[PDB]
Amino acid sequence: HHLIPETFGVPGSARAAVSELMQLFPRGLFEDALPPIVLRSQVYSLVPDRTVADRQLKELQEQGEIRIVQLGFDLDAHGIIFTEDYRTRVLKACDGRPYAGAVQKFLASVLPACGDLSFQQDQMTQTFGFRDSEITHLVNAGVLTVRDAGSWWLAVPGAGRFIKYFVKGRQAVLSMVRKAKYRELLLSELLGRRAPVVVRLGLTYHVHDLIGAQLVDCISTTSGTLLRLPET
Amino acid sequence: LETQFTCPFCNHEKSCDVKMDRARNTGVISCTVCLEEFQTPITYLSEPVDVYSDWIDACEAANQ
Amino acid sequence: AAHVIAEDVKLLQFHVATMVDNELPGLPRAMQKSGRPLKSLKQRLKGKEG
Amino acid sequence: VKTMKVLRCVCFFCSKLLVDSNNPKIKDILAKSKGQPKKRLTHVYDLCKGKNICEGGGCGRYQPRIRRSGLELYAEWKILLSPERVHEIFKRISDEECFVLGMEPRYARPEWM
Amino acid sequence: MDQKLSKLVEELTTSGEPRLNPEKMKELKKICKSSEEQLSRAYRLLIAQLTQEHAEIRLSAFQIVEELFVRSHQFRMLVVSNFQEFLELTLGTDPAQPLPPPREAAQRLRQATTRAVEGWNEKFGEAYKKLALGYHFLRHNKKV
Amino acid sequence: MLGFLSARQTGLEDPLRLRRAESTRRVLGLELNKDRDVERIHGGGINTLDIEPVEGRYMLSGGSDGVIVLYDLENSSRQSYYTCKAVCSIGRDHPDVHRYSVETVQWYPHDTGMFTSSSFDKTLKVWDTNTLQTADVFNFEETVYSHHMSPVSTKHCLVAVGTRGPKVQLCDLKSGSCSHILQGHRQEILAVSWSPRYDYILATASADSRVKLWDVRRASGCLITLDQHNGAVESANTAHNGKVNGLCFTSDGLHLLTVGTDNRMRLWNSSNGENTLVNYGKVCNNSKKGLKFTVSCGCSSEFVFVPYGSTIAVYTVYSGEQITMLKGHYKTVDCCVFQSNFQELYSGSRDCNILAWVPSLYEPVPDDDETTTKSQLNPAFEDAWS
Ligand SMILES: [Zn+2]
Ligand SMILES: [Zn+2]
């Protein structure tokens, strides 16, 4: 109280943040074929300490609550998905298809036991006993995509629809800030504006992404939160 | 003719590109490794290798 | 060294190429000693004499 | 040349066709080109050549811009495209997908090239 | 308040006039004098307005900046804190971000900026270290 | 302050606490050139700086002009404001001068009588500081991006050299050997750095996106490849989704910082390569050549000073928190170096300035009864709304 405070002049969990962001996701736009995806960027909009956010996310991965998938549209583009949504939607999509049994094997064996974003052929062949034809079934199912010879990303079937809408929406919503007067826009005014037809995923979902990705700076004002293009 | 050149400062080969800003009669050569840049007046006869030669000459003129 | 193995795979590619077609446009001819060009499988099949 | 053309017609990552086989514009091909595999490839290629994203289903991943130089292939980002891994992606193209490329897989799967 | 600042800076910078309206600039000075918060928002408005892809808006906002820089320490601190970008916006020191058309307004902007910056260097550069560094950078390294 | 002084005088707190607290407060108070200029000798950008480890009095500088400048940092004038003057220079008139830009200068770690320089003219040179004559010269096939001498090795005197070639090279100054190569990397090696804890452990970073730790005694190949995902030893591991262009061990040697052109900085456990998952946000890094950056020493928090475009970003290493942006230079900053004794930071940039950042905690105090000899309220600080 009288010494240690002199040393220098300098609470939402990732689980709560993920659970809130997951409700912004428009399930009907994909006929619920996609499991709800939250980007890792958006989690940093609700949990500003990025280190605490990342460590809590790693712990949710180790409990098996969430999957992290690489979305490939940007270097940091990681989608966060609840394991039970992922597993249900993929099994529902596999019912009676020819690749189905290998996908049931993957969801019963690899994903319960591995947190990895990617798998190498050594592990797939010798540790999990996949035949080379079963990897082909998994790629046809969309649960893997080729990273490099003998290596694959974990993937979400149909992610292209989301990724298309997200990339165009992101550029749209960023241009709404860029084109507005002073390049400034008040967040309440933006969220009240009739979203572009390009912004199919919703406007709040994108402002949380933009803030988390540091593509826009928030400034606090007496008028409320203000979006700006960053001096960069 | 060659349109990519070795930087006089950083010795990286094919590291310098020329931008011919004809409308302003000025030519800029820039190195992608060290971002040293030089500007010279250009004519309609002028070509990337004339801009590079002007830059090498300006460098040897500065060594005097 | 990576550039040596790159040049060696490039040379293997050139020889497997000139086995099928020794009349490539942008590459040297494969030749015997004394410099005569080798007849490829394509030149065996191609022309009026092929 | 066939290797280059097939690379421009499939996803460099998921090895599905870069255009939807279900789209009317492709069902037109599959009606108007029965027994004419070279015609199928030509009409699939001139649809695919303008795509850049796998959405068309699909993953979301962007696609290269491959160019030949002699016996080398350059994949635009300037990566020289290896024949291995080209083997890998071709190896994963489905028999139903390469059938729409006009390559009856009973006799000429693309990785054999 | 903020709406009055907004309208004043629009009517000053969409004006296309060769010189500021003295009465509206008097109102803008009165606002800036009245509140550090409004002066800070005026700076953040003008720097954004100096980005406009039209040289007469840049010239007007620069003329406002010149009028205010002589008049407040806090505004001098703000402007000098971003002087690298400011000079990119007003002399075009980055050839990837050149001054917008028209040339006839760009020559006015470039001359007025050179004269202003040399005056600020003489009047303030010994106090604002980054201003003296900026002047040296212009004079010797961009060879202005 | 007075609390710290009381607690120290009474032995309530270990003298360590005042010292580390005040050192931290000084780093938080860094201001541009507050008391101090550095003499402009260079005509080109300042690629590299190195402060002498024995006394911290002298700073070597290397530039894109190929000049090496030696500066004295101590104020041997009696004024409160002074210039860090150039003691001597290896200018373009010198016979042994480098032909192309000088990309790393380092003092010999054990005394000031020798220093080393490398350049894109494909040379490493060993200089006798008293005479500025070269004593030995090493030539390479490829342009040198980085070199380092081990800060703690007394047993060996090996210079690691990173070049555009894929193989790390080791020059033994004692024997004159330069034949020894390490063969694990696949592209240009942009940063090399010896561990400050262990004589024989060398970190190497490359455009291949890999950081590898070597024990240079071995015939075995490298020890560890850093995997940013933590899951496998070599086949696919990358530290960054881009070129890795800067290394800095923390001052205890227990962690390695890395920066890369994915615009991320990452902290690694040096004993096994585990990514510590500290997240610093976007750290802007476009540089296609090696980036030199530094940690603090002797503070309560360990800071890192990193070039961030034209600014120097300050972070708390373990917390990830961004503390400040030092906002002086007009072009990209290429290096910064930390004076541990007085918490003063020096920075080199392509704007050709060397800037001193110095703790500016409080001003000289007037006496109100003075007429004009006061600490002057210069009119440049005054408003003039009239
Ligand atoms: Zn260069
Ligand atoms: Zn795909």
UniProtKB/Swiss-Prot annotation, chain A:
GO terms for cellular component: cytoplasm; nuclear speck; nucleus. Belongs to the STK19 family. Induction: By ultraviolet radiation (at protein level). Residues 11-82 are annotated as: Winged helix domain 1. GO terms for biological process: positive regulation of Ras protein signal transduction; positive regulation of single strand break repair. This is Winged helix repair factor 1. The keyword DNA-binding applies. InterPro entries: STK19-like. Keywords: Cytoplasm, DNA damage, DNA repair, DNA-binding, Nucleus, Repeat, RNA-binding. Residues 98-157 are annotated as: Winged helix domain 2. Changing residue 184 to K: Increases cytoplasmic localization. Monomer in solution. Homodimer; when bound to DNA. Component of a transcription-coupled nucleotide excision repair (TC-NER) complex composed of STK19, ERCC6, ERCC8, DDA1, DDB1, ELOF1 and UVSSA which assembles and interacts with the multiprotein RNA polymerase II complex when it stalls at DNA lesions. Changing residue 168 to A: Abolishes DNA-binding activity, causes relocalization to the cytoplasm and reduces interaction with ERCC6 and RPA2. DNA-binding protein which is required for efficient transcription-coupled nucleotide excision repair (TC-NER). Acts as part of a TC-NER complex which assembles and interacts with RNA polymerase II (RNAPII) when it stalls at DNA lesions. TC-NER complex subunit UVSSA binds to the GTF2H1/p62 subunit of the TFIIH transcription factor complex, tethering TFIIH to the TC-NER complex. WHR1/STK19 then interacts with the XPD helicase subunit of TFIIH which guides TFIIH to DNA downstream of the stalled RNAPII, ensuring DNA repair. Directly interacts with RNAPII and also binds to downstream DNA. Changing residue 164 to N: Weakly impairs DNA repair. Monocytes, hepatocytes, epithelial cells, T- and B-lymphocytes. The keyword Repeat applies. GO terms for molecular function: ATP binding; double-stranded DNA binding; double-stranded RNA binding; kinase activity; protein homodimerization activity. Residues 158-232 are annotated as: Winged helix domain 3. It comes from the Eukaryota. It holds the Pfam family Stk19.
Swiss-Prot record, chain E:
It is found in: Chromosome. Residues 2-144 are annotated as: VHS-like. It comes from Homo sapiens (Human). Residues 1-10 have a biased composition (Basic and acidic residues). Residues 1-20 are annotated as: Disordered. Interacts with the elongating form of RNA polymerase II (RNA pol IIo) during transcription stress. Interacts with the TFIIH complex during transcription stress. Interacts with ERCC6. Interacts with ERCC8. Interacts with USP7. Changing residue 120 to A: Impairs transcription-coupled nucleotide excision repair ability. It is linked to UV-sensitive syndrome 3: An autosomal recessive disorder characterized by cutaneous photosensitivity and slight dyspigmentation, without an increased risk of skin tumors. Belongs to the UVSSA family. Factor involved in transcription-coupled nucleotide excision repair (TC-NER), a mechanism that rapidly removes RNA polymerase II-blocking lesions from the transcribed strand of active genes. Acts as a key adapter that promotes recruitment of factors involved in TC-NER. Facilitates the ubiquitination of the elongating form of RNA polymerase II (RNA pol IIo) at DNA damage sites, thereby promoting RNA pol IIo backtracking and access by the TC-NER machinery to lesion sites. Changing residue 32 to R: In UVSS3; mild phenotype; impairs transcription-coupled nucleotide excision repair ability. This is UV-stimulated scaffold protein A. The chain holds residues 1 to 144 of 709 of the full protein.
Curated annotation (Swiss-Prot), chain F:
Keywords: Chromosome, Cockayne syndrome, Deafness, Disease variant, DNA damage, DNA repair, Dwarfism, Nucleus, Phosphoprotein, Repeat, Ubl conjugation pathway, WD repeat. One of its GO terms (molecular function) is ubiquitin-like ligase-substrate adaptor activity. SUPFAM superfamilies: WD40 repeat-like. Residues 367-386 are annotated as: Disordered. The keyword Phosphoprotein applies. InterPro entries: G-protein_beta_WD-40_rep (IPR020472), Rad28/ERCC8/Ckn1/ATCSA-1 (IPR042238), WD40/YVTN_repeat-like_dom_sf (IPR015943), WD40_repeat_CS (IPR019775), WD40_repeat_dom_sf (IPR036322), WD40_rpt (IPR001680). The keyword Zinc does not apply. Pfam families: WD40. GO terms for biological process: DNA damage response; double-strand break repair via classical nonhomologous end joining; positive regulation of DNA repair; proteasome-mediated ubiquitin-dependent protein catabolic process; protein autoubiquitination; protein polyubiquitination; regulation of transcription-coupled nucleotide-excision repair; response to auditory stimulus. Pathway: Protein modification; protein ubiquitination. Part of the CSA complex (also named DCX(ERCC8) complex), a DCX E3 ubiquitin-protein ligase complex containing ERCC8, RBX1, DDB1 and CUL4A; the CSA complex interacts with RNA polymerase II; upon UV irradiation it interacts with the COP9 signalosome and preferentially with the hyperphosphorylated form of RNA polymerase II. Interacts with ERCC6/CSB (via CIM motif); promoting recruitment to lesion-stalled RNA polymerase II (Pol II). Interacts with KIAA1530/UVSSA. Interacts with a subunit of RNA polymerase II TFIIH. This is DNA excision repair protein ERCC-8.
